[PDB]
Design a protein around this ligand. Structure first.
Ligand code: K1E
Length: 268
């Protein structure tokens, strides 16, 4: 990768100008809009934080794929800019963007499954799969980001986003089966347009919807995001059946990523 000087980065981000050059937060840092080589970039300004820095670089060096973000360099971490932001924000229509159609959602879901597959083929565990870590390019192609906590098993330091974590990950296990569970939560956000956790909602956690539907108190049709005009029952049910399989409480009963990839392909 290229090694930028801090001064060059400070220049391209206008002193790391906090008004909306600031794009938002971010992993364990803030994201700034940059311009280097007439080329628009994302500059993320971050001892344990140095470990996440080195691990991002370490994984980005090994893993290059059409469904993963691209690190250009460091000082700060510099990436190729994703003009369509996070899936989280596009799902919430933040800053007035239009709602994603079912057609776009299917390509996104497939793309995300492809990124996760590459990671798992390369013996990497993300540990924080969520819609905020799925970015969207100039074609709305899904790209997985934030590898500061990725690992090549039990841990004493429990990391991740509670609302997306598998029960074994909340207890400390480190397994690729946990990424599958989180992805299943992401599929629910895609179907419903609802964030994984809303303190001002009942149920507060999205994952509690599998049970409602599962214990026939609910229909998946009741939850289908109403901000689409092109959803069809068959593909939505087929995407819901994948999410439901990913979300098995038992890590071993979950499909593997290669299976998730194939089922989403059979969906379209
Ligand atoms: C007030 O606004 C809020 O609260 N939010 C609104 C912004 N949200 C985030 C959206 C994604 C953003 N990261 C990134 N973004 C963009 N492009 C982009 C973002 N928006 N747009 C319109 C275009 N390219 C990137 C390239 C590489 C990396 C590597 C990392 N990490 N990251 C990003 C962080 C901020 C948080 C909630």
């Amino acid at each position: 990768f290229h090694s930028f000087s801090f001064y060059e980065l400070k220049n391209v981000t206008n002193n790391f100008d906090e008004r909306p050059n600031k794009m938002g937060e971010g992993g364990f840092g803030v994201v700034y809009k940059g311009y280097v080589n007439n080329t628009t970039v994302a500059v993320k300004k971050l001892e344990e934080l140095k470990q996440q820095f080195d691990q991002e670089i370490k994984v980005m060096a090994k893993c290059q794929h059409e469904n993963l973000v691209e690190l250009l360099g460091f000082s700060c971490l510099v990436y190729v800019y994703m003009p369509n932001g996070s899936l989280l924000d596009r799902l919430s229509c933040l800053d007035g963007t239009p709602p994603l159609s079912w057609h776009m959602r299917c390509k996104i879901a497939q793309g995300a499954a492809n990124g996760i597959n590459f990671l798992h083929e390369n013996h990497h565990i993300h540990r924080d799969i969520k819609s905020a870590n799925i970015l969207l390019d100039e074609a709305f192609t899904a790209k997985i980001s934030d590898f500061g906590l990725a690992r090549a098993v039990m841990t004493s330091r429990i990391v991740g986003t509670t609302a997306y974590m598998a029960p074994e990950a909340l207890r400390g296990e480190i397994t690729p089966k946990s990424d599958i569970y989180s992805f299943g939560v992401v599929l629910l956000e895609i179907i419903t347009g609802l964030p994984a956790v809303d303190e001002h909602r009942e149920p507060q956690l999205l994952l509690d919807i599998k049970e409602e539907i599962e214990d026939e108190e609910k229909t998946i049709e009741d939850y289908i995001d109403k901000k689409m005009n092109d959803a069809d029952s068959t593909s939505v049910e087929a995407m819901y059946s994948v999410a439901s399989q990913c979300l098995h409480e038992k890590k071993n009963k979950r499909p593997d990523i290669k299976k998730v990839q194939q089922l989403l392909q059979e969906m379209t």
